[PDB]
Amino acid sequence: VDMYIERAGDITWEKDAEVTGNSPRLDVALDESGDFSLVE
Amino acid sequence: TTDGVYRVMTRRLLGSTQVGVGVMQEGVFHTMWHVTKGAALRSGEGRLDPYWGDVKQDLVSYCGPWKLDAAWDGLSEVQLLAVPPGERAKNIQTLPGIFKTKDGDIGAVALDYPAGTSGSPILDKCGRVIGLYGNGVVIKNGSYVSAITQGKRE
Ligand SMILES: O=C(Nc1ccc2c(c1)CNC2)c1cc(Cl)cc2[nH]ncc12
């Protein structure tokens, strides 16, 4: 068995978090392979 | 077996490479299908066998059924608990955008990380996992926008 897991942290909301990223509204299509493409 | 966020590593490429990330909750390991392609996983001396998965949803669970059932409320900021290759886990707060599809709308997070960050959890203000980061689109500016991908709890 090749692949292995290793703990990286707790799942907790952090009050001090950095705030970033925009909020785009995008038209997309999902194919049978689970791949999204822009309908643009 | 402790609840929390985990890296998914392989030795099949150069050295030890991080192919993705996942969530341990209620004894079940949750990640994106494209991270493991459904292969078994090692945790120390233990084995984790796939239990459920779906290529089109791009999700997989190990040791039991998908447990994560919280959903983005469609209004509030969220946190990506990003776990990049070789880097400390860090919370990034953001207001999701929207993917509009023929089958309905899904939240989306516009944060650019390397592909081995796939499976990092997205959290609500209660610390509930509302989906996994790592399946989305490349936009004009070359950056990633990820769906907030969530499974169904049977
Ligand atoms: O490629 C990425 N995800 C992905 C790979 C294979 C498949 C799917 C998604 C869904 N079907 C097969 C990816 C992930 C992240 Cl976190 C950042 C990225 N920047 N450019 C690509 C990606």
Curated annotation (Swiss-Prot), chain B:
It comes from the Viruses. It is a peripheral membrane protein. The active site is at residues 34, 58, 118. Acetylated by host KAT5. Acetylation modulates NS3 RNA-binding and unwinding activities and plays an important positive role for viral replication. It is found in: Host cytoplasm; Host endoplasmic reticulum membrane. Residues 1-154 form the Peptidase S7 domain. Forms a heterodimer with NS2B. Interacts with NS4B. Interacts with unphosphorylated RNA-directed RNA polymerase NS5; this interaction stimulates RNA-directed RNA polymerase NS5 guanylyltransferase activity. Interacts with non-structural protein 2A. Interacts with host SHFL; this interaction promotes NS3 degradation via a lysosome-dependent pathway. Interacts with host CEP63; this interaction disorganizes the centrosome and inhibits host innate immune response. Displays three enzymatic activities: serine protease, NTPase and RNA helicase. NS3 serine protease, in association with NS2B, performs its autocleavage and cleaves the polyprotein at dibasic sites in the cytoplasm: C-prM, NS2A-NS2B, NS2B-NS3, NS3-NS4A, NS4A-2K and NS4B-NS5. NS3 RNA helicase binds RNA and unwinds dsRNA in the 3' to 5' direction. Leads to translation arrest when expressed ex vivo. Disrupts host centrosome organization in a CEP63-dependent manner to degrade host TBK1 and inhibits innate immune response. Inhibits the integrated stress response (ISR) in the infected cell. This is Serine protease NS3. It comes from Zika virus. The lineage of its organism: Viruses, Riboviria, Orthornavirae, Kitrinoviricota, Flasuviricetes. The chain holds residues 1516 to 1669 of 3419 of the full protein.
